[PDB]
Amino acid sequence: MKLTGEVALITGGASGLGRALVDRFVAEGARVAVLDKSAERLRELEVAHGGNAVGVVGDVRSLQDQKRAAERCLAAFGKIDTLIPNAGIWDYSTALADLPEDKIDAAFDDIFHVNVKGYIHAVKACLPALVSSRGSVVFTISNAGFYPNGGGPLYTATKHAVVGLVRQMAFELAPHVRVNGVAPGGMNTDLRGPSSLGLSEQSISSVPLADMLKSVLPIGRMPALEEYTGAYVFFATRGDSLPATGALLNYDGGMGVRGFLTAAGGADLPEKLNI
Amino acid sequence: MKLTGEVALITGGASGLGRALVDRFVAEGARVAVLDKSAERLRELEVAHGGNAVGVVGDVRSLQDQKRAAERCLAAFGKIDTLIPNAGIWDYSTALADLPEDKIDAAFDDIFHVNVKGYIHAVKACLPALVSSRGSVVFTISNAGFYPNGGGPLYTATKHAVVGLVRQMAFELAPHVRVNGVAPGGMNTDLRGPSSLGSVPLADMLKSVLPIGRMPALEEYTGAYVFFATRGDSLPATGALLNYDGGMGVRGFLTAAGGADLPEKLNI
Amino acid sequence: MKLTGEVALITGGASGLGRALVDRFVAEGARVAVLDKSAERLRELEVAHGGNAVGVVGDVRSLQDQKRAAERCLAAFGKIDTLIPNAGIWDYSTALADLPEDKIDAAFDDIFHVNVKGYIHAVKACLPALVSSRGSVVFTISNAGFYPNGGGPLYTATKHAVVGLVRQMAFELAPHVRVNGVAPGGMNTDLRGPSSLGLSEQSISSVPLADMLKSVLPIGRMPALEEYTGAYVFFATRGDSLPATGALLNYDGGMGVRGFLTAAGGADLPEKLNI
Amino acid sequence: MKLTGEVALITGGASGLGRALVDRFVAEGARVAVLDKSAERLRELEVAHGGNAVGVVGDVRSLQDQKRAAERCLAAFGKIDTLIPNAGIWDYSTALADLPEDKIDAAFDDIFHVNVKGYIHAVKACLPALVSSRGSVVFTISNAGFYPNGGGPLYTATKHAVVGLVRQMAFELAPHVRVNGVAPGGMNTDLRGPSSLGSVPLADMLKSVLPIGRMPALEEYTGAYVFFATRGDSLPATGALLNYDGGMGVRGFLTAAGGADLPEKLNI
Ligand SMILES: NC(=O)c1ccc[n+]([C@@H]2O[C@H](COP(=O)([O-])OP(=O)(O)OC[C@H]3O[C@@H](n4cnc5c(N)ncnc54)[C@H](O)[C@@H]3O)[C@@H](O)[C@H]2O)c1
Ligand SMILES: NC(=O)c1ccc[n+]([C@@H]2O[C@H](COP(=O)([O-])OP(=O)(O)OC[C@H]3O[C@@H](n4cnc5c(N)ncnc54)[C@H](O)[C@@H]3O)[C@@H](O)[C@H]2O)c1
Ligand SMILES: NC(=O)c1ccc[n+]([C@@H]2O[C@H](COP(=O)([O-])OP(=O)(O)OC[C@H]3O[C@@H](n4cnc5c(N)ncnc54)[C@H](O)[C@@H]3O)[C@@H](O)[C@H]2O)c1
Ligand SMILES: NC(=O)c1ccc[n+]([C@@H]2O[C@H](COP(=O)([O-])OP(=O)(O)OC[C@H]3O[C@@H](n4cnc5c(N)ncnc54)[C@H](O)[C@@H]3O)[C@@H](O)[C@H]2O)c1
Ligand SMILES: Oc1ccc(-c2ccc(O)cc2)cc1
Ligand SMILES: Oc1ccc(-c2ccc(O)cc2)cc1
């Protein structure tokens, strides 16, 4: 177990990637505080991991809620080693042309409050614990932080904003707190969109994400959620990532290195090389 | 004159770089519409340029104001060839640790609404005109869209967000509208910050910041925008990001420039 | 005319993009020294531009030849304002698996000597003139300097190497000489490959470059050579590019911002927006 | 132990980071083959690890030597799961102006042959084994693959060239072999330079260089490579570039770190 004795706070950890990370982190011997708006899912996760996980109901948009999360983590586990600001919503790749004039202001505020302000508030709230533990922050970005067509303008802009948070916060929190980014690409989660665009009851598992990506990913297949948790384990292992700050790990199946006419260049290698 | 007959719409054009841009674009034979909140400075640019500039008083955060600018530019000039969303506000380089808890949510909204939303609204308002003209968008970014310590988390995130608008809108508006970013940096102008808030002068730290070893006048940053506005010269460019900041991203560890002693080394 | 009184030295200016740049620069009122191995093409270009262009026969791999070029430019025109190191050869996207063991060492040396060493030698040779004129260097890179599948390992590695030259030289030559990169994407030129791979008598005009790129470029069409000369004009205009050093202009039709399932996202905008 | 049963081939593994990597990989339950020119240090690592390491004396510039390493690793261990091309030489940060005209062509060949060609040959030699194992390549890059002043033009260009090998080989070897780069930086080891050639200690300039404010031991850079070698943890990653350099790319203008006074600010 790589993370014995470590304590993480994960925002958005009641489902999706956040939950997989909760499960993974605990299995690696970490204790985990989760901040999330789903009270139901938070309790299921507490009973799933008796004594190694504590859920706090709150909204990542509220600094006070974030502070409560940090307080609760401190109260239960005595420190915070790794903050993983992870809660997010999608825009379902709604193009600028397709954003209605009378909804765009509301949609902007929703997606940016959650995706960017929620990350700032998480760090703000945990800053005393992180300086104390000489800890780290690992932000969940996305391939939409680097390339287009992973989201419309709003989502792509929020995830690029998060890259800026990686950079600025690695600077500001240095030398005491390390700040890095994992940018995963394509995950069968329960990811929602803004109620403003009528997408708040729409989950990404309901989209054929895996099949759209089949001929877009050089690796050929969209990885399972468990397969995305390793990068975070890595950044959360103190002895393994000490030199890392300002690091951005593109963790998306090769989206930035796909070819022009096909995703991959080496379909024929096995036969070409005779086994 | 390289922009004869072209029409530009510039947000934040009543002062600073935006005003340098208006002036340069007018001198290149373009006709310019300007959306800015400052009535006095809009009038001031209007008298400067006669009928070659039109000012519209409004707020970049307002999609309606952005539509009025668009409509005004079309009424005045018949088309919009190049849109320069440029208005932005700074955060004074206020560190996260230094953002007061009772100020932070308001600061966030103010700087994102102006710096990111006002860019989104400009494009949205101008989209019919830009597609009709097979036009261009050129976003004013900043060094803070690429490296830290050019503002606080709020400003740095806003400018990274506009890099994201470059990339996404280049994709979405292709093949008809070209979308690119200029990332200015060596500057020295009163970039205002939010009412909810309130650093070392650039001159005081120049050799730690700019390999070019000097502080360009505002006039010297308008060329990149003219280039992107010039259809004959920038046709291949979409999704491009022009770091325009005196070499901030390629500065040395001990001093910005690596070649102070080249003249002595080469005897000249 | 934007470049009246300016003097440029362009390596590889006897054909392709280099020649278009020679033509463009002269039409903008510049004087141009060209270093190139084709004596024939260099004379055609001298007579094309009587008094505004001077050709020097030489090999970009030879520092001494490069120095002669610089000497000749000085002798004819009195200064050097802008160096454009531009000469290059392709590898025809020959995959690592397809590089024969007994040719790879030779192919490496050929492509790297021309593409990287030729650029270093150009700058070295012109360095006294450039410091004297407070001039600039503008390197011809390629989309292969940023993304794969624009060349095999060799070519892609040489063009990434050139990005490193932009950065390191902008640093080293600061504050007296500015150093920037233009990275064009897809040009109907006479571009050759290494004799080692049997491609030295193979030109890129012989490849259906334009048609392969039709559904890869967000802009929809591969631009003509003339349409790529503007970026260089821009960097060569002193009053327009003074703040620029370390700049990399991706100038390739949108290759880095193409979508997953299609190159462009806005085919339908005209009808969608009602004109 | 996270690498139980896996086989690594590491070039440049008899000393520095490469030797740290060998040791770490062996401690994680991997078996390692090493290509290095230094016979003495290969023997030294061989006695250190018993049959868990095999050394092959050879030159990374030689494709035949790289094939012999590959062949030796297969004979010893039956497969190759992860290839770490790591051998590289420095240029002492010799500026272009300072490269002697009678030395420059030879220096160029020496540093490119080792730093770029030896990486190409490693992959070429190991390609059948890596495709057979659905394996990984992890190139040692450097901060000089991303920012200036980490070496001269020759070293900086070589390391930028390996970023290009990351991208191209990730494309070419997909979907079977994953290709990624680690870009180490905070280090302090005798990185040798060419015979044709011949700067400030890192310690002397640390606060201008590393936001992490310390100089990690070599042991502290092996984790990233273990990660990429761990099939259960890094399956999504191809074409990835991990800046592993103490924050060199996110350093401040006046000082590397922006938060020296956070403990006082937050009272702890
Ligand atoms: N799913 C994908 O395809 C994908 C790809 C790349 C990156 N991401 C990013 O991964 C991260 C995790 O999302 P996911 O895909 O696992 O979706 P998800 O909905 O399954 O998980 C998101 C979690 O965030 C919580 N949450 C949302 N808003 C909140 C708020 N205001 N306050 C408190 N909790 C809130 C939700 O309750 C949920 O438990 C997000 O940042 C998302 O942008 C997703
Ligand atoms: N000045 C620098 O140091 C620097 C460096 C890099 C990038 N930038 C960027 O340059 C761009 C403009 O800078 P500048 O030099 O013109 O700055 P400036 O502050 O001098 O001018 C900004 C203009 O925007 C207008 N404006 C501000 N808020 C507005 C609103 N809500 N609605 C309408 N108009 C509004 C102001 O009236 C003013 O005319 C901004 O995007 C800025 O972030 C500045
Ligand atoms: N053509 C494309 O698709 C494309 C795309 C992006 C970038 N580029 C780059 O554009 C630059 C110009 O090449 P081009 O496509 O116009 O090809 P080209 O062959 O038409 O032009 C190249 C010129 O370089 C000269 N040259 C080659 N080796 C030389 C040497 N050793 N010494 C002196 N002169 C030499 C040739 O004689 C020729 O005149 C190169 O750096 C190339 O890598 C080409
Ligand atoms: N040390 C630093 O300051 C630093 C920083 C960033 C990146 N790097 C990179 O780290 C990697 C290795 O560095 P290190 O710390 O191991 O350096 P090192 O010089 O201590 O070790 C290099 C190893 O490569 C071997 N080697 C050199 N040339 C060879 C050849 N032609 N054939 C076979 N073997 C050869 C040497 O024998 C030695 O074992 C290199 O790619 C280097 O450029 C180093
Ligand atoms: O955060 C996200 C959400 C959706 C995608 C996505 C990528 C490709 C695709 O075809 C559909 C969705 C990527 C990142
Ligand atoms: O320098 C070069 C050479 C060839 C391409 C190229 C790009 C796409 C393609 O389909 C074929 C060739 C790009 C840059």
Contacts of A257 in chain C (CB under 8 A): 147-148
Say which ligand is closest to the CA of C141.
Answer: 3
- Picking from A147, A168, A176, A245 by the largest number of B CB atoms within 10 A of its own CB, the best residue to mutate is A168
Number of Cβ within 10 Å of residue C51's Cβ equals 10
Q: Are D165 and D138 in contact (CB under 8 A)?
A: no
Measure the CA–CA gap between C224 and D119, rounded to whole angstroms. Answer: 36
What percent helix, strand, coil does chain A show, rounded to 5? 45, 15, 40
Q: Using an 8 Å Cβ cutoff, are A209 and A190 in contact?
A: no
Structural domains of chain D ordered from first start: 1-268 (3.40.50.720)
Retrieve residue C80's tokens: 């050097």
Compute the count of residue pairs across chains C and D with CB atoms less than 8 Å apart.
Answer: 137
Rounded to whole angstroms, the Cα distance separating C271 from C273 reads 5
Q: CA–CA distance from A124 to each of A65, A128, A129 (Å)?
A: 12, 8, 10
What are the helix (H) ranges across chain C?
16-27, 39-48, 63-77, 104-112, 118-133, 153-173, 209-212, 230-236, 238-241, 269-272
Residue among B43, B12, B7, B41 at smallest CA distance from B26: B7
For C188, phi then psi, to 5°, come to -75, 85
Alpha-carbon distance of B94 to B89, in angstroms, equals 13
Active site members of D: 155
Residue from A160, A91, A169 nearest A130 by CA: A169
Cβ within 8 Å, pair D95-C162:
no
Return d(Cα B188, Cα B245) in angstroms, integer: 11
Q: Are strands A31-36 and A7-11 parallel, antiparallel or unpaired?
A: parallel
| CA D210/CA D103 separation, integer angstroms | 33
Give the dihedral of Cα atoms D201, D207, D213, D218; nearest 10 deg. Answer: -20
Residue pair A107/A31 in contact (Cβ under 8 Å)? The answer is no
Residues linked to residue A10 through DSSP beta bridges, in sequence order: A34, A84
∠A98-A102-A106 over CA atoms, to 5°? 95
Which DSSP string do the residues of D196-252 spell out, in sequence order?
A: T-----TGGGHHHH-TT-S---GGGGHHHHHHHH-HHHHTT-SS-EEEESTTGGG--
3-state percent helix, strand, coil for chain D, nearest multiple of 5 = 45, 15, 40
C-alpha–C-alpha distance, residues B20 and B40, integer Å: 16
Nearest CA among C24, C21, C30 for reference residue C3: C30
From C154, C127, C134, C130, select the one nearest C142 (Cα to Cα): C154
- Asked if C234 reaches chain D (Cβ–Cβ under 8 Å), the answer is no
* Residue C200 one-letter amino acid: S
Q: Which residues contact C38 (CB under 8 A, 6 or more apart)?
A: C14, C15, C57
Contact C216 A261 (CB under 8 A): yes
- Residue D182, beta-bridge partner list: D140, D242
Distance CA A24, CA C70 (A): 63
User: Residue A95 and residue A114: Cα distance in Å, rounded?
Assistant: 20
Nearest to A170 by CA among A103, A214, A123: A123
Contact D12, D18 (CB under 8 A): yes
Work out the end-to-end distance of chain C between its first and last CA atoms, rounded to an integer number of angstroms: 35
Is A155 a catalytic site residue? yes
Q: How far is C157 from chain B (nearest CA, A)?
A: 20
The answer to whether A214 and A267 have CB atoms below 8 angstroms apart is no
Contacts of C241 (CB under 8 A, 6+ apart): B223, B224, C136, C178, C180, C234, C235
Dist. CA C250–CA B242, nearest whole Å? 9
End-to-end Cα spacing for chain B? 36
Q: Check if the beta carbon of residue B87 is closer than 8 Å to that of residue B112.
A: no
CA distances from D16 to D13, D34, D91, D190, D220 (A): 7, 13, 17, 8, 12
The phi, psi pair for B239, rounded to 5°, reads: 80, 5
Name the residue among B124, D242, D199, B143 with its Cα closest to residue C244.
Answer: B143
Q: Copy the structure tokens of residue D163.
A: 């970023």
With a Cβ cut-off of 6 Å, ligand 1 is lined by: A 12, 14-18, 36-38, 59-61, 86-89, 114, 140, 142, 184-187, 189-192, 204
Chains that touch C (3 or more CB pairs under 8 A): A, B, D
Angstrom resolution of this structure: 2.1
Please indicate if the annotation marks C18 as binding a ligand: yes
Gap from C112 CA to chain D (nearest CA, Å): 8
Minimal Cα–Cα distance from B231 to chain C, Å? 9
Query: Nearest 5°: phi and psi at D247?
Result: 85, 20
Tokens 């791999």 -> residue: C61
Residues C8-37: b if buried by 16+ CB within 10 A, e if exposed: bbbbbbbbbbbbbbbbbbbebebbbbbbbb
Nearest-angstrom CA–CA distance, B90 and C203: 51
Q: Per this entry, what is the length of chain B?
A: 268
Chain centroid to Cα D63, Å, comes to 19
Measured in whole angstroms, the distance separating CA D104 from the mean position of its chain's CA atoms is 25
Q: How many CB atoms lie within 10 A of CB D101?
A: 12
C266 in B contact zone (CB under 8 Å): yes
Asked if the Cβ–Cβ distance from D220 to A239 is below 8 Å, we say yes
Rg (CA), chain B: 19
Residue B35 phi/psi, 5° resolution? Answer: -105, 125
Residue C152 near residue C95, CB atoms below 8 Å: yes
Instruction: Locate C117 and state its tokens.
Output: 């060493």
Q: Report residue B141 as tokens.
A: 């970014």
- Listed in sequence order, the residues at least 6 apart from C199 whose beta carbon sits closer than 8 Å to its beta carbon are C90, C91, C92, C192, C193
For residues D212 and B255, give the distance between their C-alpha atoms in angstroms, rounded to a whole number: 20
Residue A202 · residue A246 · CB < 8 Å = no
Q: How many CB atoms lie within 10 A of CB A218?
A: 28
Measured at the CA of C247, the angle between CA C246 and CA C251, to 5 degrees, comes to: 145
Closest alpha carbon to D54 in D235, B179, A37, D71: D71
Q: Cβ of A266 under 8 Å from any chain C Cβ?
A: yes
Distance (Å, whole) CA D251 – CA D112: 29
Query: CA of D218: which chain A residue's CA is closest?
Result: A243
Method: X-ray
3-state secondary structure of C90: coil
Beta bridge partners of C36: C57
* Residue D14 contacts residue D38 (beta carbons within 8 Å): yes
Q: Give the H or E element holding residue C181.
A: strand C178-184
Establish how many alpha carbons lie within 13 A of residue C154's alpha carbon, considering only the half-sphere containing its beta carbon: 32
DSSP conformation class of D117 = I
Question: Is the Cβ pair A254, D238 closer than 8 Å?
Answer: yes
Q: Which of residues 75-94 of B touch D (CB under 8 A)?
A: none
Name residues whose C-beta falls within 8 Å of residue D42's C-beta, 6 or more positions apart in sequence.
Answer: D14, D34, D36, D55, D56, D57
* Biggest CA pair distance of chain B: 61
Query: Contact A90/A201 with Cβ under 8 angstroms?
Result: no
> Nearest-CA neighbor of C11 among C117, C134, C133?
C117
Find residue A248's DSSP bridge partners: A181
Return the ligand 4 atom nearest residue D218 CA.
Answer: 15
Question: Distance between CA atoms of D157 and A265, rounded to whole angstroms?
Answer: 25
Cα D87 to its chain centre, rounded Å, is: 7
CB–CB of D254 and B97 under 8 A?
A: no
Any C CB within 8 A of A260 CB = yes
Look at residues C166, C148, C190, C168 and name the one whose alpha carbon lies nearest to residue C249.
C166
Chain D residues whose CB is inside 8 A of the A127 CB are 262, 266
CB-based contact, C100 to chain A, within 8 Å: no
Q: CA-to-CA distance for B115 and B121, rounded, in angstroms?
A: 11
Residues of B in contact with D148 (CB under 8 A): 250-252, 258
Confirm or reject contact between A267 and chain C (CB < 8 A). Answer: no
B64-103 burial by CB neighbour count: b if 16+ within 10 A, else e? ebbbbbbebbbebbeebbbbbbbbbbbbbbbbbbebeeee
> CA-to-CA distance for C204 and A169, rounded, in angstroms?
47
Q: Which of D181, D59, D61, D55 is nearest to D121 (CA)?
A: D61
Strand order in the sheet with C7-11: C53-57, C31-36, C7-11, C82-84, C136-140, C178-184, C248-251
Separation of first and last alpha carbons in chain A: 35
